Amino acid sequence: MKEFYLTVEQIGDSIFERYIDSNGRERTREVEYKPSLFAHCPESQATKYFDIYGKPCTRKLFANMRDASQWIKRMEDIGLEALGMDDFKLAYLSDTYNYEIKYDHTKIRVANFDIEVTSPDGFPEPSQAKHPIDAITHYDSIDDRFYVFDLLNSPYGNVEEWSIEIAAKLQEQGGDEVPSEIIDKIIYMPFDNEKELLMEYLNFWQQKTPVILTGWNVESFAIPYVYNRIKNIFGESTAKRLSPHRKTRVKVIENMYGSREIITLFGISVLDYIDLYKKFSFTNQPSYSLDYISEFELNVGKLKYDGPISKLRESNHQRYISYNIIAVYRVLQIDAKRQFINLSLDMGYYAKIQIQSVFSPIKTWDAIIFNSLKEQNKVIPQGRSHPVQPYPGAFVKEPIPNRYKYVMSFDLTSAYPSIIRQVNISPETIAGTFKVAPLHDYINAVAERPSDVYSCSPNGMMYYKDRDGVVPTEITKVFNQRKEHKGYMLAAQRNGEIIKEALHNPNLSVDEPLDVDYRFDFSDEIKEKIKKLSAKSLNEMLFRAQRTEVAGMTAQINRKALINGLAGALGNVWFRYYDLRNATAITTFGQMALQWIERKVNEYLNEVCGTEGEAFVLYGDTDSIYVSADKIIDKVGESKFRDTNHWVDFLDKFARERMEPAIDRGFREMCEYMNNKQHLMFMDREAIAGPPLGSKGIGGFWTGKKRYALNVWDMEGTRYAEPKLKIMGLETQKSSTPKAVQKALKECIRRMLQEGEESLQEYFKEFEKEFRQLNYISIASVSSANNIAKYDVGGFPGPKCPFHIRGILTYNRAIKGNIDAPQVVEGEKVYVLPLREGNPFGDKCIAWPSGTEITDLIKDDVLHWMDYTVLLEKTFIKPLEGFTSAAKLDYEKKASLFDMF
DNA sequence: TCAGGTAAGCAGTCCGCG
DNA sequence: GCGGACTGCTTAC
Ligand SMILES: Nc1ncnc2c1ncn2[C@H]1C[C@H](O)[C@@H](COP(=O)(O)OP(=O)(O)OP(=O)(O)O)O1
Ligand SMILES: [Ca+2]
Ligand SMILES: [Ca+2]
Ligand SMILES: [Ca+2]
Ligand SMILES: [Ca+2]
Ligand SMILES: [Ca+2]
Prior knowledge:
DNA-dir_DNA_pol_B_exonuc, 8-stranded antiparallel beta sheet, globular, DNA-binding, 6-stranded mixed beta sheet, DNA-directed DNA polymerase, Palm domain of DNA polymerase, alpha+beta, DNA Polymerase, Chain A, domain 1, 3'-5' exonuclease activity, nucleotide binding
């Protein structure tokens, strides 16, 4: 087999690499890598190395990496560019793996671990590590085993061994319900003292050294805690055994308002699953506790126990250990679904970076572009310092607030990357500038044609047309991968709808789910069998379809994020190829494209309707348009349609056969106007939206920019079994809105769009009447909490104190002296509730850590003093008032002359 | 919130507005 | 009471 790296490090003048050799075995080597860097040289000097602009370079081979680094410094001292890859391990990987890497995940050791630490004096600070580690569960992907290290004897209590038999029993049997499918995979090791636990753990670690290390909050908690605890007990050298090269560094993580410390373990790639989730999931959650995320992703109930976590080991060690094991399993279950580890490995090996670098698009692209250029003996420029400067972004159309009955939407496929490819935007393809006219002049095609030679953007930039830039070349490759995965995602989605339809008529039989590949549209034969399956088999198929769709979503949206990151990287001062000429070339072209095509679509539709000056495009944002289809529907007449699906077909056909050809013609003209290299503006139909046929539903509404709701029947070719709301920006979509309020507001919107005014008024009256019974957590607002210290003045709100920060200070006074009460963590999220006049907390709100119940010693007082009226008005009524006035509707029935009877 | 761009919405504070 | 200047937070792209 072809070899592949596992990890790579520079330690002094040595490269330390762990790798899989040609026989599939893990090996480690130290290599005295001699790096090369480059300097510009005279034309008369024969060379095969050229910078990206075609200027000749001489290669400078160094005795060692430190010599190379010192040379860079001296070149700065002289004032001359020092060219080439200055991150020497990336150059080492490029030299060592000079081919597309084919990796085998089954040979990569993926460790997932979680530790427990009993602490009677509050949160166990990792940097102090003053409390014993009393449990470690460590799952190894190669062994497929959960290794459990259990401390029986502690200063905080002596306990009995954990029982696997009790662990397997139902909660209703007094057991822990450790899933039966992992029971046989547990390797349980009890220890009489902490020193032997940790020594054995380190020996185990040497034997089974993680390549990828993950878990929940492992980078901020588990790793620093284990490292510091071992350091405290045994000394530094023993703690450094966590690194296979015995090298570690305390790394200071700085944010806007403070810093924290993590431990870098050389020769290990730490991918904390919380950070994987935050980057790759495209959610924003009210809380990031594992119990909250597990419930969200897997629909598993919260791990329940009595009393504080600090007394759980002494009161119920059995449950203590079981929940440690389950917590490790939950992360593995999330990953089986979301496949973020597989994503990281894919992207990492593609770019030829340290796997943990997938968190940085700048580093990822720097390595992709470097490897690409290196193949052509081209030499990358030196990174430079740039002051951060603002620059212009997308255009967003100001919509007229209103109901909109029938709507078809269209938007560009991979807009910014397609602009890059079309215009040929790259560092080395810059050809010059042209004198710019107002943007309006290009939009309306009255401005002079920018160039008869070069490919142009309306920001004034011109680009070569003879060859593709390295940015268009490399972005195309990742775009093509994205497209393949999106194909699989959409097929799984369509397949899902086939199953949902069949579930309307399940068969009374005993059978199995069909063995099918959900990434491909079901054949006629599969469809026929599905129509004969039981509800049990259908639901199992639906679950598998949806898992396939999730896998496709992960693969596609994060490849989309990567290529969109390259467009963004051109406006990031840390990027090697930072250039505001190129960043603005993209964004300004985007602004032109949207407004150009708005004009074109308006012109086309006024023509087919025999009108003049009417606006069919009601809205657009960045690369999208929303077209009113009322007149198209009315041209055939609603009476002519058999059912909803009938007019959806008609609009689908109209969009595909009339709109899209018109749109394509408009963009082809724009391509030629800008003299672009290749037409790649593909604005495909997204949504077909409208009320159910014969209903009083309003179909859709806008309140303003980035705030709208549509009742959608077909989305990018997926015809829904049931209509689905596309809601953007409104309070139902914000993590700050109370959960129960999101639900109620969503139902209000559903009723508005599908059923009409009367239905809405019915639901509002009921929600208003019953909402005080809602659980306090379900009606609490949510906010991130930054700068708590800034606004704290002797425990009281300072000037300009934010409402949520005020809440935290109220909490802090109410729990003062309690070393045990949960502390609000700076930068994390809190629930927030308003408090009625004259409450014992002495202020208008209280806040507490999100994802948790408020501590018992104030809970009853919070509940008693909760201001339900203020809560209702702020989170429910005011947004609803916004929705209904926009839609020209009333949420409360107006008096009429019929009331006289 | 270490990690990737800008546009733009709403909550809330402070304070003006005769 | 609303709105403008401003901060904070959170979305849509
Ligand atoms: N998370 C992001 N980071 C940077 N730029 C973004 C992001 N989301 C959107 N953009 C910019 C770049 C996109 O090309 C452009 C249009 O957004 P959007 O329509 O959501 O994606 P897209 O056009 O790239 O892909 P799709 O093919 O799924 O529509 O807005
Ligand atoms: Ca725990
Ligand atoms: Ca798009
Ligand atoms: Ca059937
Ligand atoms: Ca879009
Ligand atoms: Ca599309």
